């Protein structure tokens with residue numbers, strides 16, 4: 001149920017580029033449980049904070065898009081549930 | 093209930109050329125929820141991509 005959510009979220013993120021999925025995972029703490037600042041992510045990738053900001057904005061838009069989000073419809077505290085709530089707002 | 097944007101590559105709706113965005117706009121035309129998708133993308137102020145058969149830019153429609 002939660003494990004099936006984690007698996008489905010992983011599958012949706014794997015349809016993004018490495019950089020796109022990487023920024024979202026680091027922002028939400030999907031691997032290590034620790035959300036990272038746009039600043040921290042810029043330092044890791046050696047990319048401007050501004051480009052990371054643009055990537056986060058554009059990638060969250062791709063994840064809300066029905067082309068990627070529809071499969072997640074069936075599904076706080078956890079990184080997974082927080083990403084779900086950032087994609088679907090009130091529909092959680 | 094098939095949506096056109098379940099066909100081909102999802103990134104078609106976030107294409108890097110005008111011609112690519114025109115293809116995505118055309119796919120949306122027959123969508124059974126097209127006007128609902130457009131309304132919701134406007135409400136969320138989607139920063140880019142094709143939603144409800146329109147190109148978005150900072151939550152605005154690129155109409156020209």
Ligand code: SF4
Pocket residue numbers: 066067095096097098105119120123124125126127129130142143144145
């Ligand atoms: S209108 Fe929205 S849901 Fe329908 S095809 Fe276009 S993007 Fe997908």
